[PDB]
Design an enzyme around this catalytic site. Sequence first.
Site, PDB file in Angstrom:
ATOM      1  N   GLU A  61       0.838  -1.204   0.000  1.00  0.00           N
ATOM      2  CA  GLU A  61       0.000   0.000   0.000  1.00  0.00           C
ATOM      3  C   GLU A  61       0.865   1.243   0.000  1.00  0.00           C
ATOM      4  O   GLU A  61       1.883   1.298   0.663  1.00  0.00           O
ATOM      5  CB  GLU A  61      -0.890   0.025   1.262  1.00  0.00           C
ATOM      6  CG  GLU A  61      -1.963   1.136   1.298  1.00  0.00           C
ATOM      7  CD  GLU A  61      -2.892   1.104   0.089  1.00  0.00           C
ATOM      8  OE1 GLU A  61      -2.637   1.858  -0.868  1.00  0.00           O
ATOM      9  OE2 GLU A  61      -3.869   0.318   0.058  1.00  0.00           O
ATOM     10  N   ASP A  89      -2.036  -5.158   0.906  1.00  0.00           N
ATOM     11  CA  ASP A  89      -1.400  -4.069   1.621  1.00  0.00           C
ATOM     12  C   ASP A  89       0.024  -4.308   2.108  1.00  0.00           C
ATOM     13  O   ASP A  89       0.818  -3.365   2.107  1.00  0.00           O
ATOM     14  CB  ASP A  89      -2.247  -3.666   2.803  1.00  0.00           C
ATOM     15  CG  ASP A  89      -3.554  -3.052   2.374  1.00  0.00           C
ATOM     16  OD1 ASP A  89      -3.539  -2.282   1.419  1.00  0.00           O
ATOM     17  OD2 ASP A  89      -4.560  -3.342   3.011  1.00  0.00           O
ATOM     18  N   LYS A 115     -14.457  -8.072   2.229  1.00  0.00           N
ATOM     19  CA  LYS A 115     -13.060  -8.243   1.893  1.00  0.00           C
ATOM     20  C   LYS A 115     -12.755  -9.690   1.445  1.00  0.00           C
ATOM     21  O   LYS A 115     -12.053  -9.901   0.453  1.00  0.00           O
ATOM     22  CB  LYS A 115     -12.213  -7.864   3.105  1.00  0.00           C
ATOM     23  CG  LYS A 115     -11.093  -6.913   2.813  1.00  0.00           C
ATOM     24  CD  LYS A 115     -11.561  -5.506   2.490  1.00  0.00           C
ATOM     25  CE  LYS A 115     -10.352  -4.600   2.433  1.00  0.00           C
ATOM     26  NZ  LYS A 115     -10.542  -3.401   1.596  1.00  0.00           N
TER      27      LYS A 115
HETATM   28  O1  LIG Z   1      -9.637   1.442  -6.229  1.00  0.00           O
HETATM   29  C1  LIG Z   1      -9.690   1.808  -5.050  1.00  0.00           C
HETATM   30  C2  LIG Z   1      -9.073   1.049  -4.064  1.00  0.00           C
HETATM   31  C3  LIG Z   1      -9.152   1.494  -2.748  1.00  0.00           C
HETATM   32  N1  LIG Z   1      -9.811   2.641  -2.448  1.00  0.00           N
HETATM   33  C4  LIG Z   1      -9.875   3.115  -1.051  1.00  0.00           C
HETATM   34  O2  LIG Z   1      -8.570   3.127  -0.450  1.00  0.00           O
HETATM   35  C5  LIG Z   1      -8.637   2.685   0.909  1.00  0.00           C
HETATM   36  C6  LIG Z   1      -7.808   1.410   1.087  1.00  0.00           C
HETATM   37  O3  LIG Z   1      -8.185   0.306   0.252  1.00  0.00           O
HETATM   38  P1  LIG Z   1      -7.868  -1.237   0.645  1.00  0.00           P
HETATM   39  O4  LIG Z   1      -6.364  -1.351   0.655  1.00  0.00           O
HETATM   40  O5  LIG Z   1      -8.487  -1.459   2.044  1.00  0.00           O
HETATM   41  O6  LIG Z   1      -8.565  -1.986  -0.504  1.00  0.00           O
HETATM   42  C7  LIG Z   1     -10.126   2.494   1.221  1.00  0.00           C
HETATM   43  O7  LIG Z   1     -10.648   3.689   1.829  1.00  0.00           O
HETATM   44  C8  LIG Z   1     -10.716   2.214  -0.161  1.00  0.00           C
HETATM   45  O8  LIG Z   1     -12.104   2.457  -0.340  1.00  0.00           O
HETATM   46  C9  LIG Z   1     -10.422   3.398  -3.509  1.00  0.00           C
HETATM   47  O9  LIG Z   1     -11.046   4.476  -3.313  1.00  0.00           O
HETATM   48  N2  LIG Z   1     -10.341   2.943  -4.771  1.00  0.00           N
HETATM   49 MN   LIG Z   2      -6.516  -2.397   2.704  1.00  0.00          MN
HETATM   50 MN   LIG Z   3      -4.578  -1.637  -0.380  1.00  0.00          MN
END
Ligand SMILES: O=c1ccn([C@@H]2O[C@H](COP(=O)(O)O)[C@@H](O)[C@H]2O)c(=O)[nH]1
Ligand SMILES: [Mn+2]
Ligand SMILES: [Mn+2]
Length: 178
Positions: A61, A89, A115
Amino acid sequence: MEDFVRQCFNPMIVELAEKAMKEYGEDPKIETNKFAAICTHLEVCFMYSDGGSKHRFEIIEGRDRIMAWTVVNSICNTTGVEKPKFLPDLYDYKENRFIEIGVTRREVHIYYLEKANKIKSEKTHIHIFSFTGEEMATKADYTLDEESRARIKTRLFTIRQEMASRSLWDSFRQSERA
Ligand SMILES: O=c1ccn([C@@H]2O[C@H](COP(=O)(O)O)[C@@H](O)[C@H]2O)c(=O)[nH]1
Ligand SMILES: [Mn+2]
Ligand SMILES: [Mn+2]
Protein backbone atom coordinates in the site's frame (compact mmCIF):
# COMPACT_ATOMS: atom_id res chain seq x y z
CA MET A 1 -12.75 17.94 7.59
CA GLU A 2 -10.14 19.11 5.07
CA ASP A 3 -8.45 21.09 7.85
CA PHE A 4 -8.71 18.10 10.18
CA VAL A 5 -6.94 15.81 7.67
CA ARG A 6 -4.12 18.25 6.90
CA GLN A 7 -3.67 18.78 10.63
CA CYS A 8 -3.80 15.20 11.98
CA PHE A 9 -1.96 13.18 9.29
CA ASN A 10 1.60 13.67 8.23
CA PRO A 11 2.36 15.30 4.84
CA MET A 12 3.47 12.07 3.13
CA ILE A 13 0.17 10.37 3.97
CA VAL A 14 -1.85 13.40 2.88
CA GLU A 15 0.08 13.58 -0.45
CA LEU A 16 -0.53 9.85 -1.21
CA ALA A 17 -4.23 10.20 -0.35
CA GLU A 18 -4.66 13.25 -2.68
CA LYS A 19 -2.87 11.36 -5.42
CA ALA A 20 -5.18 8.32 -5.05
CA MET A 21 -8.31 10.44 -5.17
CA LYS A 22 -7.24 12.43 -8.19
CA GLU A 23 -6.34 9.18 -9.93
CA TYR A 24 -10.06 8.42 -9.62
CA GLY A 25 -11.20 11.83 -10.68
CA GLU A 26 -12.24 12.82 -7.14
CA ASP A 27 -11.47 16.08 -5.36
CA PRO A 28 -10.19 15.77 -1.72
CA LYS A 29 -11.75 19.17 -0.96
CA ILE A 30 -15.24 17.83 -1.87
CA GLU A 31 -15.20 14.15 -0.91
CA THR A 32 -13.57 14.96 2.41
CA ASN A 33 -14.76 11.87 4.26
CA LYS A 34 -13.20 9.62 1.61
CA PHE A 35 -10.06 11.72 1.97
CA ALA A 36 -9.97 11.08 5.75
CA ALA A 37 -10.70 7.36 5.27
CA ILE A 38 -7.86 6.90 2.79
CA CYS A 39 -5.40 8.75 5.07
CA THR A 40 -6.54 6.65 8.01
CA HIS A 41 -6.09 3.40 6.14
CA LEU A 42 -2.61 4.43 4.98
CA GLU A 43 -1.65 5.34 8.52
CA VAL A 44 -2.85 2.00 9.85
CA CYS A 45 -0.88 0.15 7.09
CA PHE A 46 2.34 2.02 8.04
CA MET A 47 1.80 1.46 11.82
CA TYR A 48 1.12 -2.25 11.19
CA SER A 49 4.32 -2.65 9.20
CA ASP A 50 6.31 -1.00 12.07
CA GLY A 51 4.55 -3.16 14.69
CA GLY A 52 6.63 -6.33 14.21
CA SER A 53 10.29 -7.18 14.29
CA LYS A 54 12.44 -5.11 11.94
CA HIS A 55 12.04 -6.30 8.33
CA ARG A 56 9.11 -8.58 9.10
CA PHE A 57 6.86 -6.71 6.65
CA GLU A 58 7.01 -5.36 3.15
CA ILE A 59 4.72 -2.42 2.47
CA ILE A 60 2.69 -2.65 -0.72
CA GLU A 61 0.00 0.00 0.00
CA GLY A 62 1.22 3.50 -0.76
CA ARG A 63 3.45 2.45 -3.69
CA ASP A 64 2.70 3.42 -7.29
CA ARG A 65 1.22 0.55 -9.25
CA ILE A 66 4.37 -0.44 -11.16
CA MET A 67 6.47 -0.67 -7.95
CA ALA A 68 3.67 -2.40 -6.06
CA TRP A 69 3.37 -5.26 -8.57
CA THR A 70 7.16 -5.40 -8.86
CA VAL A 71 7.30 -6.15 -5.12
CA VAL A 72 4.40 -8.57 -5.28
CA ASN A 73 5.77 -10.50 -8.34
CA SER A 74 9.27 -10.54 -6.86
CA ILE A 75 7.90 -12.00 -3.58
CA CYS A 76 5.83 -14.65 -5.48
CA ASN A 77 8.81 -15.69 -7.59
CA THR A 78 11.06 -15.90 -4.55
CA THR A 79 8.69 -17.75 -2.19
CA GLY A 80 6.45 -19.57 -4.70
CA VAL A 81 3.47 -17.95 -2.87
CA GLU A 82 0.31 -17.71 -5.04
CA LYS A 83 -0.03 -14.45 -7.04
CA PRO A 84 -3.02 -12.30 -5.90
CA LYS A 85 -5.59 -10.87 -8.31
CA PHE A 86 -5.54 -7.52 -6.48
CA LEU A 87 -2.77 -5.61 -4.79
CA PRO A 88 -2.69 -6.41 -1.05
CA ASP A 89 -1.40 -4.07 1.62
CA LEU A 90 1.62 -5.89 3.11
CA TYR A 91 3.64 -9.10 2.87
CA ASP A 92 4.55 -10.92 6.08
CA TYR A 93 8.01 -12.57 5.74
CA LYS A 94 7.61 -14.46 9.00
CA GLU A 95 4.28 -16.07 8.12
CA ASN A 96 4.84 -16.04 4.35
CA ARG A 97 1.49 -14.53 3.45
CA PHE A 98 0.08 -11.33 2.01
CA ILE A 99 -2.15 -9.21 4.30
CA GLU A 100 -5.18 -7.12 3.41
CA ILE A 101 -5.91 -4.47 6.06
CA GLY A 102 -9.37 -2.91 6.43
CA VAL A 103 -10.45 0.01 8.58
CA THR A 104 -14.20 0.31 8.87
CA ARG A 105 -16.61 2.96 9.98
CA ARG A 106 -19.29 0.26 10.16
CA GLU A 107 -18.85 -3.08 11.87
CA VAL A 108 -15.86 -5.39 11.57
CA HIS A 109 -17.68 -8.55 10.56
CA ILE A 110 -19.50 -7.14 7.62
CA TYR A 111 -16.34 -5.52 6.34
CA TYR A 112 -14.38 -8.69 6.82
CA LEU A 113 -16.87 -10.55 4.68
CA GLU A 114 -16.81 -8.02 1.92
CA LYS A 115 -13.06 -8.24 1.89
CA ALA A 116 -13.12 -12.04 1.83
CA ASN A 117 -15.64 -12.09 -0.93
CA LYS A 118 -13.46 -9.78 -2.89
CA ILE A 119 -10.13 -11.49 -2.40
CA LYS A 120 -11.47 -14.92 -2.89
CA SER A 121 -7.76 -15.92 -2.81
CA GLU A 122 -7.22 -18.55 -0.13
CA LYS A 123 -3.83 -17.39 0.99
CA THR A 124 -4.15 -13.70 1.74
CA HIS A 125 -4.72 -12.89 5.38
CA ILE A 126 -7.38 -10.25 6.28
CA HIS A 127 -7.23 -7.99 9.36
CA ILE A 128 -9.98 -5.45 10.04
CA PHE A 129 -9.92 -2.63 12.58
CA SER A 130 -12.79 -0.30 13.63
CA PHE A 131 -12.76 3.12 15.36
CA THR A 132 -14.33 1.69 18.57
CA GLY A 133 -11.69 -0.85 19.64
CA GLU A 134 -12.90 -3.90 17.75
CA GLU A 135 -10.78 -6.07 15.42
CA MET A 136 -11.29 -9.23 13.36
CA ALA A 137 -8.67 -11.30 11.49
CA THR A 138 -8.62 -14.57 9.50
CA LYS A 139 -8.88 -17.63 11.82
CA ALA A 140 -8.51 -15.23 14.79
CA ASP A 141 -4.81 -14.91 13.91
CA TYR A 142 -3.91 -11.30 14.66
CA THR A 143 -0.30 -11.51 13.48
CA LEU A 144 1.16 -8.79 15.76
CA ASP A 145 1.52 -8.86 19.57
CA GLU A 146 -1.41 -7.31 21.49
CA GLU A 147 0.69 -4.24 22.50
CA SER A 148 1.17 -3.35 18.80
CA ARG A 149 -2.52 -3.84 18.06
CA ALA A 150 -3.57 -1.86 21.14
CA ARG A 151 -1.58 1.10 19.75
CA ILE A 152 -3.35 0.83 16.36
CA LYS A 153 -6.80 0.55 18.04
CA THR A 154 -5.97 3.49 20.33
CA ARG A 155 -4.81 5.70 17.49
CA LEU A 156 -8.15 5.02 15.68
CA PHE A 157 -10.14 5.86 18.83
CA THR A 158 -8.07 9.05 19.12
CA ILE A 159 -9.00 9.98 15.53
CA ARG A 160 -12.71 9.28 16.22
CA GLN A 161 -12.57 11.45 19.36
CA GLU A 162 -10.94 14.30 17.42
CA MET A 163 -13.54 14.22 14.62
CA ALA A 164 -16.30 14.15 17.27
CA SER A 165 -14.78 17.13 19.07
CA ARG A 166 -15.09 18.95 15.72
CA SER A 167 -18.58 17.61 14.88
CA LEU A 168 -17.13 15.66 11.92
CA TRP A 169 -17.77 12.18 13.29
CA ASP A 170 -21.48 11.84 12.47
CA SER A 171 -20.98 12.44 8.76
CA PHE A 172 -17.72 10.41 8.67
CA ARG A 173 -19.18 7.43 10.48
CA GLN A 174 -22.17 7.25 8.09
CA SER A 175 -20.09 7.58 4.87
CA GLU A 176 -18.91 3.98 4.27
CA ARG A 177 -20.99 1.96 1.69
CA ALA A 178 -21.42 -1.86 1.23
O1 LIG B 1 -9.64 1.44 -6.23
C1 LIG B 1 -9.69 1.81 -5.05
C2 LIG B 1 -9.07 1.05 -4.06
C3 LIG B 1 -9.15 1.49 -2.75
N1 LIG B 1 -9.81 2.64 -2.45
C4 LIG B 1 -9.87 3.11 -1.05
O2 LIG B 1 -8.57 3.13 -0.45
C5 LIG B 1 -8.64 2.69 0.91
C6 LIG B 1 -7.81 1.41 1.09
O3 LIG B 1 -8.18 0.31 0.25
P1 LIG B 1 -7.87 -1.24 0.64
O4 LIG B 1 -6.36 -1.35 0.66
O5 LIG B 1 -8.49 -1.46 2.04
O6 LIG B 1 -8.56 -1.99 -0.50
C7 LIG B 1 -10.13 2.49 1.22
O7 LIG B 1 -10.65 3.69 1.83
C8 LIG B 1 -10.72 2.21 -0.16
O8 LIG B 1 -12.10 2.46 -0.34
C9 LIG B 1 -10.42 3.40 -3.51
O9 LIG B 1 -11.05 4.48 -3.31
N2 LIG B 1 -10.34 2.94 -4.77
MN1 LIG C 1 -6.52 -2.40 2.70
MN1 LIG D 1 -4.58 -1.64 -0.38
